[model samples]
Target: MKGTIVGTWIKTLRDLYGNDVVDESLKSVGWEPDRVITPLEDIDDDEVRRIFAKVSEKTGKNVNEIWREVGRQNIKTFSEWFPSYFAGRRLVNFLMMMDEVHLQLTKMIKGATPPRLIAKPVAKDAIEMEYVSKRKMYDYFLGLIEGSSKFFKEEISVEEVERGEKDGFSRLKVRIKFKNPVFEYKKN
Candidate 1:
């Protein structure tokens, strides 16, 4: 995982679980309590998991609950860091463009395995999105979608269409229905 993302998680953890818990969790993972994570640094995935496990033990919250909370709160951090991505974009457009955004953002990094966030319009007021990744972070994925809707001030309903592993990859398909139609018929 990228240090930038992990760093945001640390910030979110502090916001939700408080400084003492975050510091203790970091120390449990052999990291400095005030560790500074650089944007370009690559953090070990297992170490991140260990830190999260410690956080769970300290807070008495399940790991998925912690992840979901982090996912929701992390949007604020992302918006601050990458304003261009959120500027003047509706929720549907933002969600649909995520796959390309992930690809473009990770293209320069060597050995980056960014998740595939393929989304397609299913109706005038709905879209179906597929999250394909080896990490199987479905709770976080759903939380992110929820956060995006909240950020855009758009009400939406998300239904899990499917979730399973295939060919060494985990896939989650969801149907997101919006309150208002995001598309319009055009006449020539």
Candidate 2:
């Protein structure tokens, strides 16, 4: 996991739940107070999980909900930090291009271990996206999708196609249907 993203999660948690809850959660997980996280720095996946678990216990919020809300908050944070990525992109275009963007962004960072986000148009109005990773951050992925829809002001219906580990890879497949068709039907 990227330490910077984790750092942002911490900040978002603090912003939402307040410094007291976040402080206690970090303390419970034995994480240092106010650690600076660089964008390229690697943070253990388990460390993040434990922190979220502790936060869940403290806030009485489901861990899944916490991850989802964090994912949603992450968009606002990321957009504030990197406006270029969101600029000039509609919801569908941004979603479709995320796979490429993930690859491209990772290339600029050292020791990038971002998940592989792949999507293909399954219909004129929908696309099937697969989240493949070793970390198995399913809640975070779905939360981000919801956040993206909210940010773009686009209504969407997301259906889970599958979720399970295959071999050593954790996979989550979802079919996303948008309110409007993203592609036009072409007949020969």
Candidate 3:
């Protein structure tokens, strides 16, 4: 599901910024000029993953580095195109809060890397966040607890919703929690 968002984001980036960025990104590392994945327009996750894997492989890099760089770059790019996603209220508060936590956590680790946090709501008033770590730094997981509490301004716990692992498979999980729910909603 989280993959879907990244996929969508990449597609949106293509639309907003033109295919040159993605095209150049792909070709810069030797990908065929003809290949491009149009997000939300109908794409299989495995296909996108495979395409990225190819890019990584061609560049003699790993998927993690590719994803991390892309994630950071996209954040900056998206902030320009979709400022509301990180505007004054909605998630601006949460983004700033995470920034604070990231600083403290980095200081505490003294250099240990944090994983990619693909967070989004899975419930009306709750979020289902996933952590992807190649090194499987179990300790890094705790940092988010404090950070999330501070970000949401609500009391909750992250119960592991799912976990799957195999020899070469990646370490990832979906955490679910029922946050403070004291309000109702009205639709337009």
Candidate 4:
């Protein structure tokens, strides 16, 4: 877990599901079947940065593309596991109903509370979801995320904001805005 952000997530996926699932997902992105993560357990952040750069080189992709795909797939994977969370809903409907799902999913995961997401209509096409948390629990957060993607049937971007100890000394702060609102009117 003490590696680059890229390695951290890949390690996380393997930890949650297994090497097979993670490995297969990586392969789907054209990575080598044997892309064993180098353990930089005692390395510095600069080293980790270098590692991620190397990851980009090895995978024939940049950090942004790779991470963005990971973000997208995170939701799809969640939908596969927790369909009820996102079974059938539009982005608007889902956005309107996100607080409840946040609360509901929070309870399901390790007794954590919903991180006071501030969701307000931003544009005709988007709504914002903000997260306030004490620490970084990325994997646990992925469940609700996957559900949202499954429910809304759209991709999302999770922009996080964190405060240092002098400010708040917490893990992660986030303002997740749902772009491209998916509204489902009455069926024909």
| lDDT (tens digit, per residue) of candidate 2 on 55-151 | 8888999998899898887877778776887998888888888888778867777676678889988898999999998888899899899989988
How close is every model to the real structure, measured as TM-score?
Answer: 0.95, 0.89, 0.38, 0.43
Ranking by lDDT: 1, 2, 4, 3
| Candidate 4: pairs in clash | 75-146, 129-176, 134-171, 135-171, 161-173, 165-169
Q: Which whole-number lDDT from 0 to 100 does residue 109 have in model 3?
A: 41
User: Against the true structure, candidate 1 has what lDDT?
Assistant: 0.90
Two-way lDDT contest, 1 vs 2, winner:
1
lDDT of each: 0.90, 0.85, 0.50, 0.52
lDDT of 3 by residue, 105-125 (tens): 444443444455556655565
Q: After superposition, how far is residue 147 of candidate 2 from its true place, in Å?
A: 0.6
Top-lDDT candidate index:
1
Candidate 3: list runs displaced more than 4 Å.
1-40, 90-92, 95-188
Total clashing pairs for each candidate:
0, 0, 0, 6
Q: Tell how far residue 180 is off in model 4, in angstroms.
A: 5.6
Report the lDDT tens digits of candidate 1 across residue range 75-107: 887898789989999998899999998888778
- Ordered by TM-score, highest first, the candidates read 1, 2, 4, 3
Q: Which regions of candidate 4 deviate over 4 angstroms?
A: 1-12, 15-71, 107-111, 136-188
Error of 1 at 94 (Å): 1.0
